[PDB]
């Protein structure tokens, strides 16, 4: 037993590139919270997990508040629900297992996915002509949003 309770450097390995791994993110979704994993591998990568590593399960599933681990799924959309929070956690594990080596990982990501571009409307209505006027606002305070089509 090393008995190193303190007084050292602890951990000495790096998550470098040029290796088959997993990457979970979120983009391009219309007002209903989701996620999107990505698998940049080759030659029959195996199944993977997607746990719900929360304290009280605010990042809920639809009917039963499940984790629903995938199987040979690279990109999907975990259409969750929202039981009153603005922060989460997600322990994600993936048995890679390329060739004669049971390759695994466990990344405990912390994605929080409240909306940003909070948009309100107003119409005006004249005789046989019609106009909307759209209000555009950022749901967070003093973190800015650039915007380049509408």
């Amino acid at each position: 037993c090393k008995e190193s309770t303190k007084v050292l450097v602890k951990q000495a390995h790096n998550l470098n590139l040029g290796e088959y791994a997993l990457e979970l993110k979120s983009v391009q979704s219309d007002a209903l919270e989701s996620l999107q994993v990505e698998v940049e591998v080759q030659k029959n990568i195996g199944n993977m997990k997607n746990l719900p590593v929360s304290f009280s399960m605010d990042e809920i599933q639809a009917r039963k508040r499940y984790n629903t681990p995938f199987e040979n799924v690279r990109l999907e959309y975990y259409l969750l629900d929202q039981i009153t929070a603005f922060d989460l956690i997600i322990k994600t594990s993936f048995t890679k297992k390329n060739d004669q080596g049971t390759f695994g990982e466990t990344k405990k990501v912390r994605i929080q996915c409240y909306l940003q571009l909070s948009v309100s409307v107003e119409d005006i209505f004249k005789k046989d002509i019609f106009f909307f006027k759209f209000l555009l606002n950022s749901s967070v305070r003093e973190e800015p949003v650039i915007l380049y089509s509408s």
């Binding site: 219309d30 948009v119 909307f132």
Partner: protein, 50 residues
């Protein structure tokens, strides 16, 4: 302050795309009216604007 940040933007900026609905929310009763008027002098004409 402004180092022309659109010059080095397009290489690495990801393109998020929210796409909300739009209700065209309205009511339903069409009719018309036309009231006509003629001003009666109080003080002097004040140059009324619509």
């Amino acid at each position: 302050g402004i180092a022309v940040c659109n010059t080095d933007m397009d290489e690495y900026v990801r393109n998020l795309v929210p796409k909300q609905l739009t209700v065209p929310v309205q009511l339903p009763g069409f009719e018309q009216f036309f009231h006509v008027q003629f001003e009666q002098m109080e003080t002097s004409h004040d140059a009324l604007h619509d």
